[PDB]
Symmetry: C3
Subunit: 465 residues, 3 copies
């Protein structure tokens, strides 16, 4: 068992340093690059409130009840623009435990005015212990943010004009009206300041590659390195993906590749002299030194790779404690692991169900990456065709369209570690308030005893008095 203390200190993580190889090539070829400018120019806002009305009006009576309603409101153009300018909400008043005898303030305000905040989350609470009167509570909601628009850039060859397209969820161009309000799924969105691009020139290093490697006197084409990929720029045409385009003009050329030297064939320019052994040895020594430099670069790269490998293994070993299926997944097997210490562990195998087109197996469901027993009759999804994406695909997820304005969700449908984070306080309260042990015993009967014996005792006392 370790110990926890009061000593701390603020910190931030800095990336590991990678030393570039020495003696880099010379960049002397100009490349034209066109890409869209970075600009959010999308506004998102929402607002809502929660209300509860209660009136025990005593007990053992039908005059008792606590009804609650949740509402979502739209946001106007002027309000949303003013919020974007001020980066704040304009929201109503908070009511907590208001006695209902002359205070029914939860019935006179429905828009929400007076208070400006940078963001607020509603909390719901119910308390109706005052029998002789009414009670009501009210809470409010805030939200304001910006996001970038899903876009794409394309250019033509015969005219050299470029245009920017606005894409939907599936990636298709669509008409969007600028400076207007759209409501869908309980949020309001506005688009403004249509996107623009820019052009610049970048120096790069290029060489000639042979198409056929094991055949001399073959066809060669130009290749250049831009960021992490080698592009074929033999042809002077636009070629690009997403929003970044590459072009090499005709006038900018590349140094020619000398042919192989052989006897019986004239060797380029003629310089009539007699060579000596010293020149050959000088050339040999220079080339050996160059090879030595290349070798040193090789060991540097190898050391970097080894360091990364060690770091990755330490990472996986540390992380495997929480996720018990990581080791099996990395082995392309189906086992689960439990740890006896920080170094040693055990293994335990599972089976694999037959292939299926859904996530339901006769009262079994797949959730949170695990198969568990299920009793919900209707919670099943039929598998359809899937798309595939990489980490660097530059995809956005906010689209200003029209649709249903009704919204509904539940706190029970929380993903991994979001449920725990959201319900930690409630779990702590439940655990502390209920003193778990061998004292609670009102669970051995049915709901009859709540009213039966109580009313019978009341009547017995009344006619015995």
């Amino acid at each position: 068992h370790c110990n926890a203390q009061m000593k701390t200190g603020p910190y931030k993580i800095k990336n590991l340093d990678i030393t570039p190889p020495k003696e880099t090539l010379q960049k002397d070829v100009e490349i034209t690059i066109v890409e869209t400018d970075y600009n959010e120019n999308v506004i998102i806002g929402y607002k809502g409130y929660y209300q509860a009305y209660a009136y025990n009006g005593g007990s053992l009576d039908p005059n008792t009840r606590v009804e609650e309603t949740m509402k979502t409101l739209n946001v106007g153009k002027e309000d949303l623009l003013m919020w974007s300018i001020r980066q704040q909400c304009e929201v109503g008043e908070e009511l907590i435990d208001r006695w209902g005898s002359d205070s029914d303030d939860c019935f006179r305000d429905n828009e929400g005015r007076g208070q400006w905040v940078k963001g607020k989350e509603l909390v719901k609470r119910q308390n109706n212990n005052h029998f002789a009167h009414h009670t009501c509570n009210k809470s409010w909601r805030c939200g304001i943010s910006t996001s970038k628009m899903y876009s794409r850039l394309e250019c033509q060859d015969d005219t050299d004009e470029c245009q920017v397209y606005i894409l939907d969820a599936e990636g298709n161009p669509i008409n969007v009206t600028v400076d207007t309000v759209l409501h869908r799924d309980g949020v309001s969105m506005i688009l403004k300041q249509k996107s623009t691009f820019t052009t610049r020139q970048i120096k790069a290093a290029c060489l000639l590659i042979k198409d056929d490697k094991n055949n001399p006197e073959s066809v060669t084409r130009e290749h250049c390195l831009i960021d992490n990929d080698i592009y074929d720029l033999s042809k002077n045409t636009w070629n690009c993906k997403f929003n970044r385009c590459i072009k090499r003009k005709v006038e900018h050329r590349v140094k020619k590749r000398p042919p192989t030297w052989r006897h019986n064939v004239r060797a380029k320019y003629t310089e009539g002299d007699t060579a000596t052994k010293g020149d050959l040895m000088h050339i040999q020594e220079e080339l050996m030194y160059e090879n030595d430099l290349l070798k040193m670069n090789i060991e540097l790269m190898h050391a970097h790779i080894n360091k990364l490998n060690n770091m990755l293994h330490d990472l996986i070993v540390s992380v495997a404690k929480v996720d018990e299926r990581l080791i099996g997944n990395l082995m392309n097997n189906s086992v689960s692991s439990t740890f006896l210490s920080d170094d040693t562990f055990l293994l335990m195998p599972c089976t694999n169900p037959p292939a299926h087109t859904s996530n339901c197996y006769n009262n079994s469901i797949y959730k949170e990456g695990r198969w568990v027993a299920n009793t919900d009759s209707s919670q099943c999804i039929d598998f359809s065709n899937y798309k595939e994406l990489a980490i660097d695909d530059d995809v956005e997820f906010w689209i200003p369209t029209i649709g249903n304005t009704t919204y509904h969700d539940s706190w029970k449908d929380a993903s991994g570690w979001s449920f725990i984070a959201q319900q930690k306080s409630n779990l702590i309260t439940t655990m502390e308030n209920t003193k778990f042990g061998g004292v609670g015993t009102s669970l051995s009967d049915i709901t009859s005893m709540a009213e039966g014996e109580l009313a019978a005792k009341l009547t017995s006392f009344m006619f015995g008095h």
Copy 2:
């Protein structure tokens, strides 16, 4: 606070692209490769049921009780083969809340017949609120899958015959009878279609390496690259691990390595002519261009390494939120971290207990990667010798042997994130049903009040009536 919405979309992760280096070597050497064929040919099946019988026969009585039994059944040869052919179970009927007055169906079926399913998990429920009669519930279990057999391949040199061995858990050959039924630990397994192998030829690139690097006129031996390792194939003998074997025949040879060129020594073939400066400059230019190509490959590799490093750092930074011991483990230190935001965090140190041969420290136990207080007197394991394995060791975990047919487990012994996933619904039900707050007050006394005051009130009413 962010927001959750109704907008989604199916997706799949695609691996990052790694561009191979240009101008690859030429593969002109034939290599013989022998490996075992991929074939599951192992059958696994299981079946069980759960039964509960209850009879309150009123309350305040000994005539009330809810006894439950769990049983596990074996599977025959014909049944298991038919299941494997159909990929389905043959299981009995489900009984839910059957009044016991003329319905005692939980006493007439014990094999399980009528229903064919692809997989079913049993759910246990008890309800005995009907005092005047009996009640009983029943559930059932399904399971069918296949797995590969742990095997090993070895070959001899003097005859060139290869054989496949079947290995146990420790990795020792054992006799296994084909097409028979074995029962152990509540499951049934059948082995069929003994393993086979195949032979093929693969082209590869080979060179000669010097044994002593800083000594000219030294001994050299042949080396070839197959997948990610350089193998010494100077000798024409079989050498292999697990189930994949490598061989190079005598007739297939490798190009010779020219010796170093020096003066006073004849230089291989004689071509009597006079060299000129132009030839030397041509050779120099060609070799410089080759060096340029090699350099470009170097920068490409460096860029790939940098991209991987950035991705790994982003991964660890994102993951460190859940596991608070990751940063300390990666630093070879003993600290814990808490986050103030998505970028900044704090640190807090622990201590290290003295070395021990178990996982128990005087009412302290090590579970889920953490040291916690313990009250269970007997839960301790004495450490023994440990084996070590890599991710790519090709080990299996299903072995058809004989052993005890009794099986028992508990839902309390769940590993990390399996307990949470399995008990999420029950936790939600407990939290929602119990309205945590300052209302529950039946915990301030002992179990006496369940019967004492109730019976005393009953008697008081009886003699006061």
Copy 3:
């Protein structure tokens, strides 16, 4: 649904093998390295106990209560040194459920003597069901460990003397008295055996690099590779960080770099002869073979990189199930993911709140990496300047200074997966003891019914008897 079984086996993880490139450079340059010796020489110890005193003295009375106290004790010099020698505690006796009629042992011992243990964690339990008498419980604490001291090494040039400095949390030298006792935050620390260093010689490979790459006849300086970085050692001065210092002496020199060979210029040593085509072809063949070796090293490095990339992608795919914000973080976006199977998943976007200097948004707090609703009025931290550190910065976290001896903490302030690990048993007990369902009904009223109806029934029975 898979299955869990009784079959297991101890194991340990072995790091993946990285084959170094063939034909490594020759190491012939001596380098002087000075670093501090590895030595813990810091002692940490602590001790405490927990006591509870209770006396129901019946019920319905003020004579009932359960008061508990927690105390922390200092450790003397002799006691801590003796513990360090024996690697054990010297702790008192455990009292469990002692009837108070002639047994008040929880009032006579306050130091803790008799028992020697290697480590013990206290468990707190309260039970006061014996009305006629008293009861009390007692528990105890243990702790002993060692850690290394935060230090730094510096050396001077004109004299070649090195010294070791002791650093505080911020990294500043401070006076520390050796062999003395310091108390702070409820722990005791002792420093002994002030640090020392050592000197050794290491062979390394060095070359000459040009300062200006695209200009012949430029200035060059010496560079050497030590572990994973290339250091400039052109000057014979000490240069070092943390505690490891590097030096190259004047007498140890590096081989000179030959100049470029050109016509009209004498080529180093003169050897008057006539070259032939055979010599040139021999040189060409040798250099081509060297280039082939370099290429093979290139493909080996590429294969290693590809293997690492595949392993990292498998790791992230497996881990993404628990942390639903990993995919969005790796994409530099703000989305959350839910999984339909082990391969396919969905996406769901959030918003981004405006920039702020704290972690509180009007009843919202940031904890465990998530934004959740908050009701605690005062739990907020104002952001200050942050430091940045790498994984390999060699920082320690135990400092023997003076300060407040009072300590206090709570089990509610647990970080990620520490709360779950510590409260798993209590959660299991709460879930099992409370049979969640539609039976608990004592929550529909207020705390009045605990005493009201009970006392009224008591009085009714008393005057009806």
